[PDB]
Amino acid sequence: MDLKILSLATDKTTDKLQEFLQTLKDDDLASLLQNQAVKGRAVGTLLRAVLKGSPCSEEDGALRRYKIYSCCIQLVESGDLQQDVASEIIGLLMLEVHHFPGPLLVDLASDFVGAVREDRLVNGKSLELLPIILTALATKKEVLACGKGDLNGEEYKRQLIDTLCSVRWPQRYMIQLTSVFKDVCLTPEEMNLVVAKVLTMFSKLNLQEIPPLVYQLLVLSSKGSRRSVLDGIIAFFRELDKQHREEQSSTAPADELYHVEGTVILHIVFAIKLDCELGRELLKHLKAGQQGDPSKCLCPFSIALLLSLTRIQRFEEQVFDLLKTSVVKSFKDLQLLQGSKFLQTLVPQRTCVSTMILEVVRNSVHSWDHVTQGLIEFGFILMDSYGPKKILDGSKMTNQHACKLGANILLETFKIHEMIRQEILEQVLNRVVTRTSSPINHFLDLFSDIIMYAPLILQNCSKVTETFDYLTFLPLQTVQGLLKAVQPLLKISMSMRDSLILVLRKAMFASQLDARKSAVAGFLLLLKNFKVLGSLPVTQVRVDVHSRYSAVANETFCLEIIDSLKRSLGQQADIRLMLYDGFYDVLRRNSQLASSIMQTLFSQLKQFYEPEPDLLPPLKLGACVLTQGSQIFLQEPLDHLLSCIQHCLAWYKSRVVPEEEEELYSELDDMLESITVRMIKNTNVGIKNNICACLIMGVCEVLMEYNFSISNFSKSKFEEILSLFTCYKKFSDILKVSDSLLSLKFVSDLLTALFRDSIQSHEESLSVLRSSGEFMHYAVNVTLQKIQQLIRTGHVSGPDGQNPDKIFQNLCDITRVLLWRYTSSISLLCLEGLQKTFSVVLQFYQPKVQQFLQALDVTVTQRASFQIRQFQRSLLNLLSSEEDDFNSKEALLLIAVLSTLSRLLEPTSPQFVQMLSWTSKICKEYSQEDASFCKSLMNLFFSLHVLYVTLLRDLSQDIHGQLGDIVVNLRTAAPTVCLLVLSQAEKVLEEVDWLIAKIKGSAPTLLIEKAIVMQLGTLVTFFHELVQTALPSGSCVDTLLKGLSKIYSTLTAFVKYYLQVCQSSGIPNTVEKLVKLSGSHLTPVCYSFISYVQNKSSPIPNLVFAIEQYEKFLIQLSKKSKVNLMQHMKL
User: Fold this and answer.
1) Of 460, 733, 875, 897, which is most buried, counting CB atoms within 10 Å of its CB?
2) Where are the annotated coiled coils located?
3) Whether 148 contacts 136, CB under 8 Å
4) 435 φψ region: left (φ > 0), alpha (ψ -120 to 50), beta (else)
């Protein structure tokens, strides 16, 4: 057998070879099966002779090969044969398939598709033939003899593949199946066929099997449809994520899902490296543009992809713009949606890109390093770009929200990833020490948070310590923030503490003022955290107990500093003030310093206090002024020196009750009383006097505070308190804002004591005060004035001034006391102060809103509508009994309180209706001739309303009727309520414009379109009223013009939208009917309004061009679509 075939190969073609074949016909099965079992290399050339013994020139040759080919294939898959034998066989089969005729190749390939139905091949190695078969087919464009011939090589190859896609691929070989298409040239249809069919499988595989498949799919894209490949992978995982995230609301998968997603992301970034189009496509695809998309565009997965794509340099700038701009859009839209009810009806809420990126950080935990670098770097770009700027140099909601997300990314990455912890920190600090005058505060806050998070990481942190060297070179505001935040580290690392001491030690010697002002803040801060244990008898730290490790701090540590600080009391007034403030804070935290601080304060007063009993100027106010060379400065703000000694004494008496101190605190008590009694008794000369004036004004204001807290009892002291005010008022008339030296706790207590407090024995307390009555509203003026100063900055003058808990408390205290007086002219102030209170509590203390309302007595919305009722009732009362001219001022800010409160009302709510409907009642049932009042009532009306074009169309009917045609009255609606409905409607147009642009971008839809019509329809009716009517020529004319041309731009936008939508067409009655409703009620009435202007008077062109362009696209619309409506607009 074997040998006899060897001669035929070395003899010649045809006669020798082909004749032996016809002799056999029986088993090339049993022969080949066992001939490789004997020797595989004897089988290796067995084909070469037999294949050249059966050419395509003869059929018995060609139709014989088909049997051989099927036997080789059968053995390769079924047999256990070694891979050298296996791959040698398919080696030959692949290289000899070239010349087989069209009919046979089709049969061969259909045998594969036949195998595909159900087989255990265990081998796709058979399938490696398929590519060569399918290509050899497409070579021949000629009809072939099979069945109905009617088909070229390309079409049988297309129908073969076509069938391969409709048959089920087994879970086992499907990877090898997809790697088979790798070598086969395809049509776009054949591609999308193979692709979309591979995709149909994803949902059928165990998750861990997808990444290799996705890899195998992506190698096809290289020849093959980028956008659809990506969109597929993205869409698959987006959905997969969606489910897992709903499993989270009710680790397990997280290991697999996210590890795979990382590998998958890692795979496509890898492709983007080799092919840039792939990248440029991923960007083109994901890019927001019209905003309906970026909500559905970006998902945690795609964002993570983008962020990992960052690692390829060239794409970085782009990835960041996309993300940066999407974070703003995402917010600015949701910011809009919350503003209008109608938008909520049309558009459902959307997860915003913000909380998406944060989920990326969250999910980044599982082996995503590639994603972190771009993550932290993005977080910074937000903080960099959206951080506050001009506030330092003489809707930012987005600016803020962006910046915070920048911080949150940064903080949360830090928490999650140990390896970048250092780089995040270095990056923050280096901005702090390096950045300009440009405000760094937001960066210090993050620095604070990182530290506070885990002080243990940074305890050492030379990078923090090294920062201190710039302590003098940095702005005081920075140094404070830096020190405050750095505290938890100081309590831990000795070497950092000691290094800060040494730095501060010599900071004190800096000539420059601001430098020393910093050094002080530092020491003062140290003293708050640092104790001694000394020689003695919030838990600061003992600097003293380790003497081997500290070369600087000793038992003298606390006193050493106070002495160092003492010298500043002889320095500029500005410093002394700062040292007075510090001493109190410090004293409160450190008990042992009471003597040392007090001593210093005491001996300071000794300079300004006349000891000789009764030399009537009890304090020497001449020494408070220094003069050098034509300039008169105040040194030593005595009024604060007094306040400080007051608040310390008050503390020492108050708190420490567990000797040379008791002699100190008596002698100062003696001195304060002595001053108390004795006290009641432009050009350089005058510049000094004015200072002294408000010095005393303060001194009296301080002595007032002191004699109250001395004893809250006697009528005898309140007699002094009044007399002390009588001295204060005395100078206050003789001549002021944040200047109130009364601590806010005091301004609370006494206002609670004056109004609410009666039950106490003394009516003479109140009377000594109430009877003056200027003191009465002076005491209400400080409170009202400090609350206001509390909205200018976050601070307030005295002790616990910046403590947000003590401030909230004092706010609650003061509020309900102003409420007691307003339920019962001072009563006017209370409202004004009461007003500023609410506004502060809401826009600062918001989370404490629930607490706040409780101090005043669904439940949050309950408290709101309760207070609203009390106010809306006293507004109605002001109106119902209103006498002629009464108050434009009380009516104004009474509405302000309501508008502030109404924002607490849930937009759904039963209570919210009570407020809206009630307002609607006042609008219809009232009027008045002061413009101030209506614009407010309207704004409040609108404010509540838009969360519920009627009002607009109706409001115009009024102005239109009460003006022109050439409840609010002539003086009311003409100048004012005109501009409002115009502005309001303009906004309602911007809405429509966005809707109109939204639908265009999609390349439930109708439900919106008909709402757009009804919206625009009611608006045309609105303008018609105004376009008819005469209005004062000054402004409202121009505003009505601008507003008009806007509708025409909106309609034009609605028009060229249907030019687009009807290319794919019917333009239903909705559209049509109202299209000519414009060319009847508007167009002509407009042309007539422009003539009103020129005939009266003796922008303009912008109205006509708008109407012209409006018609120009109606001409294009009507012609190219269906209806003659434009010809019906002229009728």
Assistant:
1) 897
2) none
3) no
4) beta
Instruction: Give the angle subtended at the CA of 84 by the CAs of 83 and 89, to the nearest 5°.
Output: 95
| Residue 760 exposed, middle or buried by CB count within 10 Å (0-12, 13-18, 19+) | exposed
The C-alpha atoms of residue 300 and residue 362 are separated, in whole angstroms, by: 10
Q: Exposed, middle or buried by CB within 10 Å (0-12, 13-18, 19+), for 1066? A: exposed
Written as six digits, the tokens of 882 are 């209103």
What amino acid occupies position 840?
V
CA angle 1068, 1071, 1073 (to 5 degrees): 95
Alpha helices in 52-152 (DSSP H): 59-78, 83-96, 102-117, 129-138
Q: Alpha-carbon Rg of the chain, whole angstroms? A: 43
The amino acid that residue 927 corresponds to is: S
Q: How many residues in total does the chain contain?
A: 1131
Q: How far is it, in rounded angstroms, from Cα 355 to Cα 468?
A: 36
Work out how many domains the chain is built from and give that number: 1
The span from the CA of 175 to the CA of 169, in Å, is: 10
Dist CA 1063 CA 1059 (whole Å)? 7
Distance CA 718, CA 772 (A): 12
DSSP 8-state symbol, 443: H
CA 671 vs CA 610, 612, 706: distances in Å: 10, 11, 12
DSSP lists the bridge partners of residue 1097 as: none
Tokens, residue 846: 């918001």
Q: Are 298 and 326 in contact (CB under 8 A)?
A: yes
Going from the C-alpha of 888 to that of each of 800, 827, 831, 898, the distances in angstroms are 37, 16, 14, 16
Q: What are phi and psi of 632, to 5 degrees?
A: -115, 115
Residue 425 sits in which domain range? 1-1131
For strands 541-542 and 530-531, give the pairing. parallel
Residues 6+ apart with CB under 8 A from 856: 812, 815, 816, 819, 863, 867
The CA distance from 1036 to 615, in Å, is: 70
Q: At what angle do helices 254-274 and 210-221 cross, to 10 degrees?
A: 20
CA distances from 293 to 225, 299, 301, 401, 1010 (A): 21, 11, 16, 21, 22
CA–CA separation, 1025 and 1082 (whole Å): 10
In the 8-state DSSP scheme, what is residue 439?
A: -
CA distance 488 to 528: 12
Please give the Cα distance from 318 to 321 (Å, whole number). Answer: 5
Measured in whole angstroms, how far is the alpha carbon of residue 37 from the centre of its chain?
Answer: 72
Resolution (A): 7.8
Nearest to 938 by CA among 908, 958, 963: 958
Closest among 829, 826, 824, 843 to 901, alpha carbons compared: 843
CA distance linking residue 597 with residue 627, whole number of Å: 29
CA distances 108 to 65, 472, 841, Å, are 11, 86, 82
| Tokens 């750095």 -> residue | 486
Query: What residue ranges in 586-646 does DSSP mark as E strands?
Result: 625-628, 631-634
Q: How many CB atoms lie within 10 A of CB 991?
A: 19
- Tokens encoding 367: 């082996």
In angstroms, how far is CA 172 from the centroid of its own chain? 47
Q: List 619's β-bridge partners, or say none.
A: 609
Experimentally determined by: X-ray
Distance CA 1044, CA 971 (A): 24
Interior CA angle at 54 toward 50 and 55, to 5°? 130
Distance separating alpha carbons of residues 815 and 818, to the nearest angstrom: 5
Whether residue 400 contacts residue 331, with contact meaning beta carbons closer than 8 Å, is answered with: no
| Residues 6 or more apart in contact with residue 429 via CB below 8 angstroms | 447, 463, 464, 467
